[PDB]
């Protein structure tokens, strides 16, 4: 099992090649945060794949210097380049050479002969090497590296330092200079170190902290302060100082983030004209068909289950059942009646008399096509539903062709009259109730909905959030969006009204549509954070004041000025020392 | 430039990605052979309904239109300044002059100043010095 330990301050490096002196320079870069939890390893009596993340802080304490190798990359099948690093008898040896990996690469060590450890031919990491897009050649001790990929640059920082500790990362701070900078470009999600087989070592994970660095007169980092670490260190990041003198400092701000969201539309009142399409009195013809805008409506498709229903229900693009969860953007019902066999011809990419001539679905069509029999009504016969027999070509996507110009088979001009080589292009279906099931009139509606990428007009059959109070939420009421604390409220609207407001025109009170009730609003919390400290010369302890909040959303104490943390209230009263607010004054002593 | 007069013979060996589950990040190469799955059912690596091999190759014929005439696009990529210069223009390193106002370039770093001898002491890997104001205060003669 991987055992943890405490990173301490290790893992600070020179972020670029600039020189400075006696300056405290803020920098924001990928770092190993202070006191983060760091995985810990062995070689005893063990070199698993590890996630590369955004980088690694590797370190290996050594006496006999057994941990000599690294294998990095995405795959480990050779499909990419894998950086390889082999440190042989103090000679740096580096390769990006591509090869087909064996599971368990290593180095051999044989005991006590003229070649010490031998097996400097051991070296079975793999079958054989193919491409090399680079090449290079060249507890007492501790060796510390940092490996990160940016700009196709795999950067290597190093400190070779002696130590006295057996157990763990020594507690002390020295910062890493760049050893090499191979810009191979190959990505690395995973890696495997390379060991000598008869050695503790660490892996941290770089994270985008902000540090405050101290370049000494020689231009060496003697100190670093991690901003996000804790209250006191956020201060030093504002002051650019390592000694924060006595008194209160505003550092950051906290914005209480909302809980989830509230979408609210009034129930049963917003209903889409689905019947005025499905149940419409007389559908427009298949050659000219009704495109009825379907928008601004909660989807009523769930009522469609109990009815005479449909000869077919066919959704080309997406699942018919997920419609319950699926809110729309552009829905246009394509409403017409046809002969029986031609519901078939309605589908993306169909070739037929309907599909090519009087009605056309695109090949990319997405939506639910819906057809059912009119044999019980539209049949009596009935010549009123008519079709297009002839056209010069196939139709374009959703082409409505009403053109009554007489179709002409020959080159001799017909001049717009019927005759030989002169045909009226639009032919009618006679509908007799005893006609074949494929001659029966079928009532077709084609819902064309565009799915994602656009704001939603047609509301999902449910698409409803329940309502929560006294808890910061991110709310939408009948298209009104806002984020606040929704509460009960006694202010009384006029009936026709919608939004309450305030002197600032900012939204204040609202009315819940599904059940009329007057809800207040309220910003999240805010207030500034304030770090009350005695001088860093006295203590490193700080008491945080959250300004102008109630103590929930955070040894705690409630004040007039806000939520104070980490300072014990005192009923005694002394001279004001560090001014806070509204008479509250803090001092360090017992 | 046009490869239509050479690569086109057409040419199926020049291939493109017809589908990706997202849009690439800069210089991100997707070499994965994974089929594009447009359905909920697993493609299991094999094609089918809503399973398309996303990597397609235009056949490039010299008869194909100018739109389909294959063009070879080489994108030169350079890092500008602040870094040691490897690719350099036809400019050979001049002599250095001190205590006299000079325009200058060091390793691509450019400015105008009075170059002098200075005793501030770099760490070896370093390049620039800098002052409090993020000006370029002190530089090391690379050669």
């Amino acid at each position: 099992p991987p055992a943890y330990t405490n990173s301490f301050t290790r893992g600070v490096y020179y972020p670029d090649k600039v020189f400075r002196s006696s300056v405290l320079h803020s920098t924001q870069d990928l770092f190993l945060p202070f006191f983060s939890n760091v995985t810990w390893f062995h070689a005893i009596h063990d070199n698993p794949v590890l996630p590369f993340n955004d980088g690694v802080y590797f370190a290996s304490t050594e006496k006999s210097n057994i941990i000599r190798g690294w294998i990095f990359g995405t795959t480990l099948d050779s499909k990419t380049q894998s950086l390889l690093i082999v440190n042989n008898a103090t000679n740096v040896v580096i390769k990006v050479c591509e090869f087909q990996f064996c599971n368990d690469p290593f180095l051999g060590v044989y005991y006590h002969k003229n070649n010490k450890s031998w097996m400097e031919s051991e070296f079975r990491v793999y079958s054989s090497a193919n491409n090399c897009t680079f090449e290079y050649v060249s507890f007492k001790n501790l060796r510390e590296f940092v490996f990160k990929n940016i700009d196709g640059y795999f950067k290597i920082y190093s400190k070779h330092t002696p130590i006295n500790l057996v157990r763990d990362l020594p507690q002390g701070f020295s910062a890493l200079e760049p050893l090499v900078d191979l810009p191979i470009g190959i990505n690395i999600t995973r890696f495997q170190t390379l060991l000598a087989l008869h050695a503790a070592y660490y892996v941290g994970y770089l994270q985008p902290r902000t540090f405050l660095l101290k370049y000494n007169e020689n231009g060496t980092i003697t100190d670093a302060v991690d901003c996000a670490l804790d209250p006191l260190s956020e201060t030093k990041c504002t002051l650019k100082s390592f000694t924060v003198e006595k008194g209160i400092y505003q550092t950051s701000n906290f914005r209480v983030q909302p809980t989830e969201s509230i979408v609210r539309f009034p129930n049963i009142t917003n209903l889409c004209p689905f019947g005025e399409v499905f149940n419409a009195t007389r559908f427009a013809s298949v050659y000219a068909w009704n495109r009825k805008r379907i928008s601004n409506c909660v989807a009523d498709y769930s009522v469609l289950y109990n009815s005479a229903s449909f000869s077919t229900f066919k959704c080309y693009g997406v699942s018919p059942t997920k419609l319950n969860d699926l809110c729309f953007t552009n829905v246009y019902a394509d409403s017409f009646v046809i002969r029986g066999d031609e519901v078939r011809q309605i589908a993306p990419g169909q070739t037929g008399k309907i599909a090519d001539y009087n009605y056309k679905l695109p090949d990319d069509f997405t939506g639910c096509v819906i057809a059912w029999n009119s044999n019980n009504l539209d049949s009596k016969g009935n010549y009123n539903y008519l079709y297009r027999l002839f056209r010069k070509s196939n139709l374009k996507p959703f082409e409505r062709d009403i053109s009554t110009e007489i179709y002409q088979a020959g080159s001799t001009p017909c001049n717009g009259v019927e005759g030989f080589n002169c045909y009226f292009p639009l032919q009618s279906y006679g509908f007799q109730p005893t006609n074949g099931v494929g001659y029966q009139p079928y009532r077709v509606v084609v819902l064309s909905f565009e799915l994602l990428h656009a704001p939603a007009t047609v509301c999902g059959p449910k698409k409803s959030t329940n309502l929560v109070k006294n808890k910061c939420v991110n709310f939408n009421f009948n298209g009104l969006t806002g984020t606040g604390v929704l509460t009960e409220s006694n202010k009384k609207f006029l009936p026709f009204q919608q939004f309450g407001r305030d002197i600032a025109d900012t939204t204040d009170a609202v009315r819940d549509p599904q059940t009329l009730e007057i809800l207040d609003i309220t910003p999240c919390s805010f207030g500034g954070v304030s770090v009350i400290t005695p001088g860093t010369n006295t203590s490193n302890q700080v008491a945080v004041l959250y300004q102008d909040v109630n103590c929930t959303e955070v040894n705690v104490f409630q004040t007039r000025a806000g939520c104070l943390i980490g300072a014990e209230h005192v009923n005694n009263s002394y001279e004001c020392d560090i001014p806070i607010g509204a008479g509250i004054c803090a001092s360090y002593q017992t | 430039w046009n490869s239509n007069n050479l690569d086109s013979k057409g040419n199926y060996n020049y291939l493109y990605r017809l589908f990706r589950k997202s849009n690439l990040k800069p210089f991100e190469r997707d070499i994965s052979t994974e089929i594009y799955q447009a359905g909920s059912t697993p493609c299991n690596g094999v094609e089918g309904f809503n399973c398309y091999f996303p990597l397609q190759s235009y056949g490039f014929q010299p008869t194909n239109g100018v739109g389909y005439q294959p063009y070879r696009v080489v994108v030169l990529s350079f890092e500008l300044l602040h870094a040691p210069a490897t690719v350099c223009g036809p400019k050979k390193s001049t002599n250095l002059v001190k205590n006299k106002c000079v325009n200058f370039n060091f390793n691509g770093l450019t400015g105008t100043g009075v170059l002098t001898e200075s005793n501030k002491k770099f760490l070896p890997f370093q390049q620039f010095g800098r002052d409090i104001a993020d000006t370029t205060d002190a530089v090391r003669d690379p050669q």
Epitope: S309, F310, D341, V437, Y442 | -
Partner: antibody, heavy 119, light 106 residues
Framework: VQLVQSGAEVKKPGATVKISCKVS????????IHWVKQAPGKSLEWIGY????????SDNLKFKGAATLTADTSTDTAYMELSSLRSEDTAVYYC?????????????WGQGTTVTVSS | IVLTQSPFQSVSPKEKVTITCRAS??????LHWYQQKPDQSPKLLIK???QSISGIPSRFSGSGSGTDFTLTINSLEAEDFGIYFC?????????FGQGTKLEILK
């Protein structure tokens, strides 16, 4: 003439199962495929009919497994996946040939796909 | 949109069995009958309720009137008796009969 199906898949509750039925002996693109489930000792339960040419389906609502019928043009192999599995879904799955219009018969099936959802 | 079938159908050889397919609300001209032998896929005996596919015994018959459809088999044989289903047609997807288990005594 033949409908060749994937083997018997036995799964856990909340797991997923996808199941193939291959078309041969007749024209694949010309015929839709019904899909009819038979629970143990129970009646025929119709999950969906599919199209070879189009990837959309009509779904009996009933049991909700996010069922998606997916055929194949090259292999003529019609998959039926049932996800979010539950011990009710233990049953036989019969792929069933259909027409390319209102007319709906199945005169030929596979052998049926026995599937067990059990803990 | 819901149709039911006779659970069991006990009769004697040569006698004519009639098995009702009763579909609630509106019914469709078309219907299809499924003979199932144990541990086997049901077999389609009937098309549009009016037609049997070739090789299926002409003793098998089906029809409909009002909302009622009936599977009528004349002169049952000892190989015939099996589980019966009837398709719903159009009117949204098809609820098969609950099944009709046919036994032949004697």
């Amino acid at each position: 003439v033949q409908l060749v199906q994937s083997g018997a898949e036995v799964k856990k509750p909340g797991a997923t199962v996808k199941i193939s039925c291959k078309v041969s002996g007749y024209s694949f693109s010309n015929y839709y495929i019904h899909w009819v489930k038979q629970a143990p000792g129970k009646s025929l339960e119709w999950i969906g009919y599919i199209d070879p040419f189009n990837g959309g389906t009509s779904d009996n609502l009933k049991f909700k497994g996010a069922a998606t019928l997916t055929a194949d043009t090259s292999t003529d192999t019609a998959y039926m996946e049932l996800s979010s599995l539950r011990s009710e879904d233990t049953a036989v799955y019969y792929c069933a040939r259909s027409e390319y219009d209102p007319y709906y018969v199945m005169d030929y099936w596979g052998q049926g796909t026995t599937v067990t959802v059990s803990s | 949109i819901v149709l039911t079938q006779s659970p069991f159908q006990s009769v004697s050889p040569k006698e004519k069995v009639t098995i009702t397919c009763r579909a609630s609300q509106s019914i469709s001209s078309n219907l299809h009958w499924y003979q199932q032998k144990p541990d086997q896929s049901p077999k389609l005996l009937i098309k549009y309720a009016s037609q049997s596919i070739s090789g299926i015994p002409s003793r098998f018959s089906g029809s409909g009137s009002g909302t009622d459809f009936t599977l009528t088999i004349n002169s049952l044989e000892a190989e015939d008796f099996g589980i019966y289903f009837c398709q719903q047609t159009n009117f949204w997807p098809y609820i098969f009969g609950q099944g009709t288990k046919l036994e032949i005594l004697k």
